[PDB]
Write a protein that binds this ligand. Structure first.
Ligand SMILES: [Fe+3]
Ligand SMILES: [Fe+3]
Ligand SMILES: [Fe+3]
Ligand SMILES: [Fe+3]
Lengths: 201, 201, 201, 201
C-alpha cells in the first residue's frame, strides 16, 4: 500500500502514569490504523475515477483524502514527539531553545500560548508548533479536526492531540490535567531533529 | 514586517486575454495585500497576548493567522505559477512530466482530476497539486477558503484560485471557461522548480 | 420536484441604483437555480441509497443536501427581504421596532452589529438576524458559506448575502459600500411579518 | 441569565445498561453546563461590544455564540429524546409513523439512513432527524461539531450525539454498538410531540 501504520517507538505503557497504555493501544491500533486504511482507500478511488473518467464523487474523495491523510500525518508525528519521562530532556536546548526564545520570548511564553491553543479548541483538533517556511519562523497553530485551520507548507514540529479519544478514558472532561501531564513526556530531541530538517523550507 | 506583498513577475495585463488586467490589479493590489496585513496583524496580536499573559482571544488569533497566512501563501504561489503565453512550454517535460504520468497515468488524466476538483468546490476554495512528503507522491487537494481541507506538510506545486473574485468580472458564473483559459498561462518551469526543491525532502 | 425556484417579487432592475439588475439576473437565474437543482438531486440520491441499501456516499449526500438546501433557504429569504426604495419603511416599527430596541438597545446598535458581522466574514457567508426560539430573543449570526455557524431551530428574519457574487460586478472589493447601499432596499414589512410568525417557536 | 441548564427528566442511571450513569452525569453536569455558560458569556460580550461601539472581536463572538448555543440546543433536545426502556413504544405510531413511511419508505429505511449518517461522521458531530419547513418533509442531516452542516430554519425532532464524550467511556471506539444500544431508549412520544408542533409551520 501507499501508506502504512508506523509502530510505536516504545511500549504501550511506556508513557505512564501520564498517558495510560489503554489509551495508547486504542489510539494507535484502532484510530491511527483507520486513517491509514482511509487514506489508501481514497487514493484507490481517485485512481478508479481517472480510469473511467468519472469524477462525480470528487468532492467526497478529496475530503476523504485530506481527513485521513492529515490524521495519519498528525498521529505519526504525535508518537515520535513523545518519550518516557527521563528518556529525553525536559526542556529545549541549543538551536531549538534559541529559536523558541526568538519567536516567543521564552520557553514559558511558548508553553503558555501552546497550552491556551490546546484547551480553547471548539470541537476536535490539535495544538501545533510549526515551521513557517515563508516567514522563516516558528508559530503555533490550532488545527480543527485533522485537516483544517492551517497554511499549506506548514511543517509540524510538535503536536498535541486534543480529540476526546486522546484523553477521555483517563482525564474525563478535564482537558487541563491532560495538557499538564503531557508536557512531562515531550521528546525535545525529536522536536529538535524536525526543526533541523524543517528550517530548509 | 514579517510578511511582505511580493510584486508580480509580469505586467498586470500580460496574462490577457485569459485573465484580464482589471482582475490582476484588484486581485494583487487589494486582495493579496489584505492577507499580508492580516497575517502581520495576527502575529502582532499574539505577541501582545504573550506580553500581557492574556490568551482570551487565542481562538480568534489562531484563525486570523491561519486564514491570512494561508491567503498570503496561496496567492504568492499563484502569481509565480503563471506566465505570459509563449514564455514556457504548454506541457510538462522531463522530471515533472515523468512524475505526472507516474502518479496520474497521463497529463490529460491529471488535468481532468484537477479540473473536477476546481469546478466542484462548494464555497470559496482552491484546486491544488501538492507534493506529499509522507507518501512521496503528487496528489491533488481541494482547499476550502484558504486554510481548510489539507494535511500539514503539504508542499504546493501548482494552485488555481477558485474564489469568485478571481474570475467573476470576466467569466461571471461560468467557472468552467475560467479554468479552461487558465491552463494556457500555466508556467510549467515554475512548477518544475517547486517539484525539484520539494522532492529533496 | 420537491424544491422550486421562486420568482422575484419585483423586476430585476427594481433595486437600482443600489443593486444592479445584472447582478440580480445572474444571482437569481443562475446561482439560486443551481441550489434548487442541487437540493433536489441530493434527495433523489438519498432515495436511491435507501432502495439499494447502499449508504456509501452518505457523507457526500448529507453535505450536498445541507449546502444546497441552505443556499435555497437563504436566497429565498434574501429576495423577499428587499424591495425598491420608497416601497417600504426605511426603519422597523411597532413590535419589531420594540423587539430590536429590547435585544440591541436601539436600531442603530443593531445596524452597527449587523454591519460588523457582514464585513468581517473570512470567506463566503451571510450576516443574519434570527429569532432564537430557545432564548426567545433576536440575535445576529454570521453564517459561513450557506450552512455553517448556526444553531438548529434558528429562524431567519433578515439576511445579507456576503458571497462575492452578490456584489463584485458593481462594488468590486469594497464590501463596505455594498453593505451601506443594501440598507436602502431592506423591506422592513417582510421582516416584521417573519417576526410575527417566528416568535411562536 | 438568558440560558439555563435544564434538569434531566429521569435519574442519571435510568438509561442503563444502554447508556451508563457515569456518562450521563459527566455529559449533563459538565459538558452541557459548559455550553450554557458559554452561550450566556457570548451574549454578555456582544452587549458590551455594542455599548463600547467596538466590534473588533465580532468574528470570535459570533462563533462563540453559534457553537455554545447550538451545543445547548442539541443537548436539550437529546435529553428529552430519551427515556427508560418501557416508558414509550419501541416504534413510531400514528401521525409520526405515517410521516416516516412517507419520507423514508419504512421505519427500517429511516433507521438505516440515520445510522449511516451517525457512524460516518469525520470528526465530532450529530445525526439528526429534522422537519424541513420549506419542503414540508422530514430529512436526516449530519451536523459537524454542533453548529455546522445544516440549513437555517431546520427544526430538530430526533438527535443523536456522536461526539466521543457521548460514548467513549462505555463503548470506546466502537461507534456502531453505541448507536445500536441507543435505539432502545428513544422516546418516540417526545419526537411525536415535536413533529406535531413543528408541522404547524
Ligand atoms: Fe487522535
Ligand atoms: Fe484570490
Ligand atoms: Fe448568493
Ligand atoms: Fe455531547
Amino acid at each position: 500500500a501507499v501508506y502504512t501504520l508506523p509502530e510505536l517507538p516504545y511500549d504501550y505503557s511506556a508513557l505512564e502514569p501520564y498517558i495510560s497504555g489503554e489509551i495508547m493501544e486504542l489510539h494507535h491500533d484502532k484510530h491511527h490504523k483507520a486513517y491509514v486504511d482511509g487514506a489508501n482507500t481514497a487514493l484507490d478511488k481517485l485512481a478508479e475515477a481517472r480510469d473511467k473518467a468519472d469524477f462525480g464523487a470528487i468532492n467526497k474523495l478529496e475530503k476523504d483524502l485530506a481527513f485521513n491523510l492529515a490524521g495519519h500525518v498528525n498521529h505519526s508525528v504525535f508518537w515520535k514527539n513523545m518519550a518516557p519521562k527521563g528518556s529525553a530532556p525536559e526542556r529545549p536546548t541549543d538551536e531549538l531553545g534559541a529559536a523558541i526564545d526568538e519567536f516567543f520570548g521564552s520557553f514559558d511564553n511558548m508553553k503558555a500560548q501552546f497550552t491556551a491553543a490546546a484547551t480553547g479548541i471548539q470541537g476536535s483538533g490539535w495544538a501545533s508548533l510549526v515551521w513557517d517556511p515563508l516567514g522563516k519562523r516558528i508559530n503555533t497553530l490550532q488545527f480543527y479536526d485533522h485537516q483544517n485551520n492551517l497554511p499549506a507548507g506548514s511543517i509540524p514540529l510538535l503536536q498535541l492531540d486534543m480529540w476526546e479519544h486522546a484523553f477521555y478514558l483517563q482525564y474525563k472532561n478535564v482537558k487541563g490535567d491532560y495538557v499538564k501531564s503531557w508536557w512531562n513526556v515531550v521528546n525535545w530531541d525529536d522536536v529538535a531533529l524536525r526543526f533541523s530538517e524543517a528550517r530548509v523550507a
